[PDB]
Scaffold this active site. Structure first.
Site, PDB file in Angstrom:
ATOM      1  NE  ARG A  71      62.377  20.597   8.300  1.00 12.12           N
ATOM      2  CZ  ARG A  71      63.065  21.166   7.298  1.00 12.12           C
ATOM      3  NH1 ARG A  71      62.511  22.038   6.472  1.00 12.12           N
ATOM      4  NH2 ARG A  71      64.352  20.895   7.155  1.00 12.12           N
ATOM      5  CD  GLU A 196      56.694  19.819  -1.591  1.00 13.14           C
ATOM      6  OE1 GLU A 196      56.922  20.974  -2.026  1.00 13.14           O
ATOM      7  OE2 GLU A 196      57.543  19.092  -0.985  1.00 13.14           O
ATOM      8  CD  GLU A 197      54.378  24.687   0.702  1.00 13.04           C
ATOM      9  OE1 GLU A 197      54.429  25.291  -0.380  1.00 13.04           O
ATOM     10  OE2 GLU A 197      55.189  24.918   1.631  1.00 13.04           O
ATOM     11  NE  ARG A 212      56.979  24.341  -3.262  1.00 16.72           N
ATOM     12  CZ  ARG A 212      57.656  25.039  -2.339  1.00 16.72           C
ATOM     13  NH1 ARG A 212      56.997  25.765  -1.412  1.00 16.72           N
ATOM     14  NH2 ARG A 212      58.997  25.039  -2.342  1.00 16.72           N
ATOM     15  CG  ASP A 213      55.135  18.751  -9.684  1.00 20.28           C
ATOM     16  OD1 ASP A 213      56.266  18.639  -9.161  1.00 20.28           O
ATOM     17  OD2 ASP A 213      54.772  18.033 -10.643  1.00 20.28           O
ATOM     18  CG  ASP A 244      55.118  26.396  -8.475  1.00 16.90           C
ATOM     19  OD1 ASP A 244      55.373  27.211  -7.551  1.00 16.90           O
ATOM     20  OD2 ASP A 244      55.231  25.165  -8.288  1.00 16.90           O
ATOM     21  CG  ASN A 266      62.677  26.596  -5.578  1.00 14.54           C
ATOM     22  OD1 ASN A 266      62.018  26.554  -4.502  1.00 14.54           O
ATOM     23  ND2 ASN A 266      63.508  27.601  -5.874  1.00 14.54           N
ATOM     24  CE1 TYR A 324      55.940  29.053   0.239  1.00 12.26           C
ATOM     25  CE2 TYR A 324      54.644  28.057   2.044  1.00 12.26           C
ATOM     26  CZ  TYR A 324      55.728  28.026   1.174  1.00 12.26           C
ATOM     27  OH  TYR A 324      56.603  26.980   1.230  1.00 12.26           O
TER      28      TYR A 324
HETATM   29 CA   LIG Z   1      57.443  23.776  -9.142  1.00 13.00          CA
END
Ligand SMILES: [Ca+2]
Ligand SMILES: *[C@@H]1O[C@H](CO)[C@@H](O[C@@H]2O[C@H](CO)[C@@H](O[C@@H]3O[C@H](CO[C@H]4O[C@H](CO[C@H]5O[C@H](CO)[C@@H](O)[C@H](O)[C@@H]5O)[C@@H](O)[C@H](O[C@H]5O[C@H](CO)[C@@H](O)[C@H](O)[C@@H]5O)[C@@H]4O)[C@@H](O)[C@H](O[C@H]4O[C@H](CO)[C@@H](O)[C@H](O)[C@@H]4O[C@H]4O[C@H](CO)[C@@H](O)[C@H](O)[C@@H]4O[C@H]4O[C@H](CO)[C@@H](O)[C@H](O)[C@@H]4O)[C@@H]3O)[C@H](O)[C@H]2NC(C)=O)[C@H](O)[C@H]1NC(C)=O
Ligand SMILES: *[C@@H]1O[C@H](CO)[C@@H](O[C@@H]2O[C@H](CO)[C@@H](O[C@@H]3O[C@H](CO[C@H]4O[C@H](CO[C@H]5O[C@H](CO)[C@@H](O)[C@H](O)[C@@H]5O)[C@@H](O)[C@H](O[C@H]5O[C@H](CO)[C@@H](O)[C@H](O)[C@@H]5O)[C@@H]4O)[C@@H](O)[C@H](O[C@H]4O[C@H](CO)[C@@H](O)[C@H](O)[C@@H]4O[C@H]4O[C@H](CO)[C@@H](O)[C@H](O)[C@@H]4O[C@H]4O[C@H](CO)[C@@H](O)[C@H](O)[C@@H]4O)[C@@H]3O)[C@H](O)[C@H]2NC(C)=O)[C@H](O)[C@H]1NC(C)=O
Ligand SMILES: *[C@@H]1O[C@H](CO)[C@@H](O[C@@H]2O[C@H](CO)[C@@H](O[C@@H]3O[C@H](CO[C@H]4O[C@H](CO[C@H]5O[C@H](CO)[C@@H](O)[C@H](O)[C@@H]5O)[C@@H](O)[C@H](O[C@H]5O[C@H](CO)[C@@H](O)[C@H](O)[C@@H]5O)[C@@H]4O)[C@@H](O)[C@H](O[C@H]4O[C@H](CO)[C@@H](O)[C@H](O)[C@@H]4O[C@H]4O[C@H](CO)[C@@H](O)[C@H](O)[C@@H]4O[C@H]4O[C@H](CO)[C@@H](O)[C@H](O)[C@@H]4O)[C@@H]3O)[C@H](O)[C@H]2NC(C)=O)[C@H](O)[C@H]1NC(C)=O
Ligand SMILES: *[C@@H]1O[C@H](CO)[C@@H](O[C@@H]2O[C@H](CO)[C@@H](O[C@@H]3O[C@H](CO[C@H]4O[C@H](CO[C@H]5O[C@H](CO)[C@@H](O)[C@H](O)[C@@H]5O)[C@@H](O)[C@H](O[C@H]5O[C@H](CO)[C@@H](O)[C@H](O)[C@@H]5O)[C@@H]4O)[C@@H](O)[C@H](O[C@H]4O[C@H](CO)[C@@H](O)[C@H](O)[C@@H]4O[C@H]4O[C@H](CO)[C@@H](O)[C@H](O)[C@@H]4O[C@H]4O[C@H](CO)[C@@H](O)[C@H](O)[C@@H]4O)[C@@H]3O)[C@H](O)[C@H]2NC(C)=O)[C@H](O)[C@H]1NC(C)=O
Ligand SMILES: CC(=O)N[C@H]1[C@H]([C@H](O)[C@H](O)CO)O[C@@](O)(C(=O)O)C[C@@H]1O
Ligand SMILES: CC(=O)N[C@H]1[C@H]([C@H](O)[C@H](O)CO)O[C@@](O)(C(=O)O)C[C@@H]1O
Ligand SMILES: CC(=O)N[C@H]1[C@H]([C@H](O)[C@H](O)CO)O[C@@](O)(C(=O)O)C[C@@H]1O
Ligand SMILES: [Ca+2]
Ligand SMILES: [Ca+2]
Ligand SMILES: [Ca+2]
Lengths: 388, 388, 388, 388
Positions: A71, A196-197, A212-213, A244, A266, A324
């Protein structure tokens, strides 16, 4: 000129054919290629393109040093012609920021970029390449979104956002956009515990997102969205084929309504196609890092907590780096069904290859075939030693 | 296909969202980026673009040495895609010269470039990308113009020019163009005492320009133009929030009809939006140099000589270099109001960073939001040390 | 969609305004710019572009060594956007060869390139970007053509070719093309004794060409073409203002029907506008080499053997290098008259600057104004020392 | 908007004029040019372009080392503007793979790329720039195709594929595609004994392909296809003018229905135009390697086993390197006949020039003239020493 509707089902996936590959890191060793990460692919009615978050510097550039960081003020969503590399000269900026999504509704494209400091980020929603709507951070902790394409149905394009902790309960919202304006938003419901994502696709008037957890789950959470009713549910992939990364070894029974434990705090962005017996999961081959990539046919993975593979295809050998992965389709193709596609981000440089000071990636993507095609593996192909 | 009319008022400005940023100096460290200065942004009905005065050399090029100088035969007005850098390969030349303005009237674009020696300059007015009208110097002392976009109403595009001294009374004219031809011109009237580099915007059939009084004023002069009657007035921003640079410290009472004293013979191009309580001023943070940049909400700044800020937003930290700033809007956007935008020129190199032999810049721009968005700061981002 | 007709007269030329300048050699010091020579400018109904003969190598490239040579298999006619440099990435190849002309007839463009060994050259005539007609050498000695734009009237585009000696009588032909096909050709008639490199323009259904008498003439030969009757005449500029190079000093009386003597077997491509009192001649300032460039108003130069200048404008100082110059106009502009334009080739490198192993050029062009504009000079601007 | 039909005969070929040349290796010495091989040319109704298999690296790039190898994951079919070089910034990816063909049917373009390991390759057939059909290897030994353009008639585009041994009997198939879908396929019939890399053209509703018999033949095999009946025949060029490479010396009598012996297990892609007395063959000049290139007029070469040349034209001197050659025409040109064209691949680097670690090429192409034009030779033009 009319909004696209998700009127078709998924084509039968019997294998995966090569769709696109940019060889960006190989080529950028000696040409003006932008440092990127968080790429994807998205189609307009007349063209499909590669997308990514630029780092605002070329790979050979001195400013590539420090690009492991996610970022900065120098990032932007760019798009570029399919299988070309993202160069300074061919890259089109969609919006400024360090987290994004994008999708075409059949008339024109919505693009969303989030920027700002961690405690004060904001989304700006562009539509027909102009800014229309802005959304301020609600939980003051890295407002963030899909990092792959959204999906539209009759003008309505749902988008999944999260704001709050990466390592604990957070505040996820589903925004329903139309022409860049907010029709509605909802807080996350169902049994997914962290989101997420999200990687999303559309078929027969339903949008399925595989996410994504980051906090607890080595199985992946799933949100399914009704873009007409503007409602959703969430659960996990029931399957013991865990997708994952990092993750523990595959068990014999998964979890449908809770994170599969063993690894905390993660993950990686990934995807699936969930269509009864026509169900295929992507994962890294490694359980430890973003290494390798394979597709596995796992009939009823979503709903069957003992479901195991019946077929597969290696995409990237476990001796090559991945990253990804995410879903897209060409909603404007001919024929009677939507052909599933995906991309894999092939990450090079830091942290796994620390002899260089940069982090970047290239892209490979595949779409499904109804044939049973022979497989190859598709590595990034660059020699890090050349950059030394 | 019809001329645009200024039929809308300004949207309510509650904050500023990121619009575009090219990171040109960071990227140009290792790619073919043109040395520029005096940039801006301007929209066509189908596209918004970045504009600047090229120096006719790349930044890494040996000819970048000496680019602190404002006026040479090697300069040109170029435009390029939004948030891209101005590269040799993507830059479109609008006209040749070392001072410029440009605006689209709804049918096509007028561009104006001035060139020549100091005592013998001339403007050429291009329209639909062909030369139409030429104007010779009237005072034989650096004929010069806005360095940001002009504004049109029903085919009529007023432009502010100055010819004569930078440190004493000069000869400012308002030209009213239509299809590149002179309909009318007027000498400057009202109480503004010196005018340079006007930053202009249009709303409800009136054009407001915030300019630079180089000779005496640390408050900014304001010209307001009726593009139908083809008449104008001028005064100063009454507010004690002083917005030129260099400038003395803010007093408690400004001056409405005279330059606020304390600094002579210098200044910087800047802008404001002057709309009753919806009034926002830009300034450098530093009173001494082109350092930092902020927006301040100063209700009734134009007419209230004691008006002070009620809200603000930092754009560039005072530990980062700024430069010229100016106004534009997307007159062809959807909705019921015009959304205020601005850019800030982020100058790098000479004179403040003299370890390099060049002067260039990159661009950041923002447009207003009706939300109260969180703020970030937006520096150029380049490391001068890399260029050594 | 209809063929253009030369229905307008020339606008009154009271001075010359800057039109375009590419600064190619300055920029190409550090970017991928093609080595060129023999440039020009030519307009389509929607766009004007720069044209030149590439040498099939960049300036910084190792293959730039030897580019003093005129004729190789690596040359091609390229075009590129106005005032851009001719780069590898923005240059469009029109055809392959080492001598060329090009013009748009109102519907589409004809381009002609000659290639081959000196004793066996051939022209290929392209139309709508396809090859249509081919012409073999008739005198077996460097078949060659204008090196600037041709001119069309109602579909008919005359082109001047020469084949045979550069230092003695040669065989010049006027070809009348329509849609790339030969309607007619004629041998040269009238009193011009040697013809090369004609610079042409059109007004009121007549095409005037100012050419190069390489063999004997320091005055310039003139061909005037009726594109309806498909006939022509030739003579010389009567004026004692001599406009070839090298040349002897200006006398007080010229020659109308014979070469003005004093210099044999050399010359440069140049141009004029011949329009009664509205007559302007270009020349190098130097009588010895391609140094400097000026425009001179010489009323009745074509027909008056004692005509002298009544007005002028310096384009390039005699302390700067020039080269070829030639005529074009934007036949598709608005208004009631054709605005005269020209370009000057600014040659850098060999033979005059032999510390580099290359020869290239950049371009400057001007069009006429009805104003009496102030003058600047327009040098190439590059430092040869930087290339060492 | 309607499918093209092969309604015209071949124009009379009296000589060959220069059509295009990219000088890629000369230019790529100092600009971002992709390493290629296996090039060709193919026209759309509005544009003709250069095609080749990229190696996914620039020539100056460090990854150019090892590009002698034919088949990697980093290869792709690219196209680029005619006579431009294939650069990173102007090259459009058609599909991913290491063997290809491409042709436009009058409405849109079909492109085919094969990828995969030697024992498990697959073709993907793209149409209107989307993937439509996939074909798995049938003999598990380098599935491979034309390396030059296919030809369409009323929507039907036949393509020749081979799978199996390069040094023994193999499995060749003719696929008949329409809109990217398989209408029909046939195994190879007739007397051709081995088929690779067919070079094809269309006239009067018949498609003629001149191919490579890698196993035994130094004469070339010929397939003729009826795209309406979707049937074919095969034989060899009867002529004793042998046109493969390497090859033995020309005899006085050829073979019509069997490979001409003397050289086994090697060859080069080449082409011919077979049209009674209007018959022209291309060959390398050398019988030993890909050195030189000439065209020979050999009346009735297809059917006459004693036919010898009656006319010729040298394209590349035997002191310069050549490579693959193949056929294309502009089916959308004006006039009453199809003008025969061809390209020659000019290979540089390994294996013949081993002081560099790369293999690449540039392109030259010619089309026929009805004139008897003078000849030049057209070498690649690069100095290998410069790359050292
Ligand atoms: Ca995970
Ligand atoms: C030419 O190209 C073609 C096309 O690609 C190539 O052919 C392909 O070859 C590949 C590689 O072999 C195949 O991929 C594997 O597929 C199997 C699934 O297929 C086997 O199992 C099927 C299911 O069988 C149960 O049910 C059936 C009834 O439904 C029952 O009959 C059976 O007895 C059983 O009880 C069988 O149906 C299937 O048989 C058909 O196909 C056969 C050919 O494959 C043929 O021979 C048969 O006769 C029949 O007709 C077959 O037996 C996947 O299981 C496998 O994925 C495992 O292994 C790889 C390593 O190879 C690993 O990376 C994967 O993740 C996966 O294994 C992990 O996960 C499991 C699930 O939790 C776990 O149990 C494993 O222990 C393992 O776990 C460890 O690794 C993971 C990952 O690192 C980690 O997370 C864990 O913690 C742990 O550490 C492969 O995908 C293609 O399917 C096949 N394609 C086609 C069309 O045939 C051909 O080879 C190429 N030719 C050449 C010459 O190269
Ligand atoms: C998340 O993001 C958000 C969104 O950006 C962040 O929130 C923002 O935070 C920034 C920074 O604090 C704010 O900018 C400052 O705004 C103030 C104006 O607001 C104060 O004053 C208002 C006016 O008050 C008078 O009237 C009112 C009635 O109208 C009366 O009630 C009052 O008593 C008073 O008499 C107040 O209304 C306002 O209160 C609302 O908002 C508050 C939050 O800000 C909240 O707490 C309140 O309860 C209330 O609800 C508030 O008190 C500007 O004044 C200020 O600009 C000055 O200071 C900066 C340095 O910080 C300087 O650079 C500026 O130039 C400016 O000051 C110079 O100029 C003055 C004018 O001449 C002069 O007086 C000063 O001495 C000073 O002069 C020196 O410097 C200059 C420049 O170098 C030089 O030229 C001179 O010569 C001299 O050397 C800032 O703009 C945003 O407004 C705020 N935005 C929002 C939506 O809230 C949030 O912080 C981020 N979160 C995190 C966690 O980071
Ligand atoms: C701001 O910008 C403006 C706009 O550009 C600048 O103003 C311009 O200034 C330039 C430079 O001075 C002018 O160019 C020169 O123009 C003259 C022509 O004009 C003079 O002559 C006119 C004709 O006069 C005969 O007829 C008239 C009647 O018709 C009669 O009245 C008269 O007595 C005479 O018998 C006059 O009408 C004219 O007067 C108007 O304008 C005046 C301003 O210029 C003004 O003051 C007047 O009151 C009046 O109102 C004026 O007197 C050209 O002759 C000259 O070109 C010669 O000289 C240059 C060197 O300067 C040379 O390079 C040229 O080639 C040319 O001379 C060679 O060729 C001749 C012809 O064969 C030969 O005779 C010469 O000996 C000479 O030959 C040698 O050199 C050549 C070339 O190297 C070589 O080949 C030979 O062998 C030999 O070695 C210039 O073009 C612009 O016209 C003027 N523009 C305007 C609009 O005013 C202003 O200066 C700038 N301001 C600042 C502050 O910088
Ligand atoms: C300006 O530009 C122009 C235009 O390009 C230039 O003019 C051209 O010049 C070139 C070079 O000379 C010509 O190419 C050669 O063409 C001949 C074919 O033409 C000769 O033969 C014709 C056929 O004659 C039999 O039949 C006729 C009746 O039909 C009968 O009359 C005759 O007696 C005979 O029995 C004649 O008709 C023709 O005569 C017309 O044209 C003449 C000009 O050329 C003119 O003078 C005449 O009066 C008449 O009007 C003429 O006599 C090809 O045969 C030749 O190709 C051979 O040689 C080259 C080397 O030069 C070689 O590379 C070729 O491969 C080829 O030879 C090999 O293959 C043969 C076949 O198997 C074999 O027999 C040979 O031994 C040889 O084999 C060895 O080499 C190969 C290849 O390496 C190897 O594989 C073998 O194993 C072995 O090692 C050339 O193509 C153009 O045709 C001509 N164009 C035009 C329009 O005129 C002009 O020169 C330029 N001007 C200047 C000043 O530079
Ligand atoms: C035409 C021209 O030279 N404009 C220049 C102006 C003038 O010098 C001032 O407005 C005084 O008139 O300001 C600059 O120097 C500056 O301050 O950065 C830049 C600009 O290029
Ligand atoms: C076809 C050709 O070679 N043209 C060349 C001509 C001829 O040499 C002369 O006109 C004599 O005929 O002039 C040049 O050499 C020159 O003077 O700079 C450049 C040009 O390339
Ligand atoms: C698919 C494939 O590998 N094609 C290659 C073919 C085959 O090797 C032969 O046709 C033998 O089958 O020929 C080349 O090696 C060659 O001769 O230059 C290049 C080409 O890339
Ligand atoms: Ca001031
Ligand atoms: Ca001469
Ligand atoms: Ca062979």
């Amino acid at each position: 000129r009319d909004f696209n509707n998700l009127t078709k089902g998924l084509c039968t996936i019997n294998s995966w054919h090569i769709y696109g590959k940019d060889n960006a890191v190989r080529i950028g060793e000696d040409s003006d290629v932008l440092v990127t990460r968080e790429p994807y692919v998205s189609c307009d009615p007349d063209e499909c393109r590669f997308y990514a978050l630029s780092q605002g510097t070329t790979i050979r550039g001195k400013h590539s040093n420090g690009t492991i960081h996610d970022r900065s003020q120098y990032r932007a969503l760019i798009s570029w012609p399919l299988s070309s590399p993202p160069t300074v000269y061919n890259s089109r900026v969609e919006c400024i920021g360090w987290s994004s999504t994008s999708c075409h509704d059949g008339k024109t494209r919505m693009s969303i970029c989030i920027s700002g400091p961690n405690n004060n980020a904001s989304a700006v929603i562009w539509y027909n390449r102009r800014p229309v709507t802005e959304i301020n951070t609600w939980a003051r902790n890295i407002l963030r979104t899909q990092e792959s394409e959204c999906v539209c149905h009759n003008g309505v394009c749902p988008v999944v956002f999260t704001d709050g902790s990466a390592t604990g309960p957070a505040e996820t919202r589903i925004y329903y956009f139309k022409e860049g304006k907010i029709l509605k938003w909802e807080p996350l419901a169902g049994t997914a515990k962290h989101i997420e994502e999200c990687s999303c696709y559309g078929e027969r008037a339903e949008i399925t997102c595989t996410c994504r957890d980051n906090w607890q789950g080595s199985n992946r959470p799933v949100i399914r969205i009704d873009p007409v009713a503007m409602t959703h549910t969430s659960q996990y992939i029931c399957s013991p084929v865990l997708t994952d990364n990092p993750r523990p070894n595959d068990p014999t029974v998964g979890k449908c309504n809770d994170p599969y434990p063993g690894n905390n705090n993660n993950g990686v962005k990934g995807f699936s196609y969930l269509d009864g017996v026509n169900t295929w999961l992507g994962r890294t081959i490694s359980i430890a890092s973003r290494s390798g990539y394979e597709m596995l046919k796992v009939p009823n993975a979503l709903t069957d907590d003992k479901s195991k593979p019946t077929q597969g295809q290696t995409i990237v050998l476990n001796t090559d780096w991945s990253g990804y992965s995410g879903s897209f389709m060409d909603y404007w193709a001919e024929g009677e069904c939507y052909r599933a596609c995906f991309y894999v981000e092939l990450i090079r440089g830091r942290p796994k290859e620390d002899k260089v000071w940069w982090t970047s990636n290239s892209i490979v993507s595949m779409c499904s075939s109804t044939e049973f095609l022979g497989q190859w593996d598709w590595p990034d192909g660059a020699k890090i030693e050349y950059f030394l």
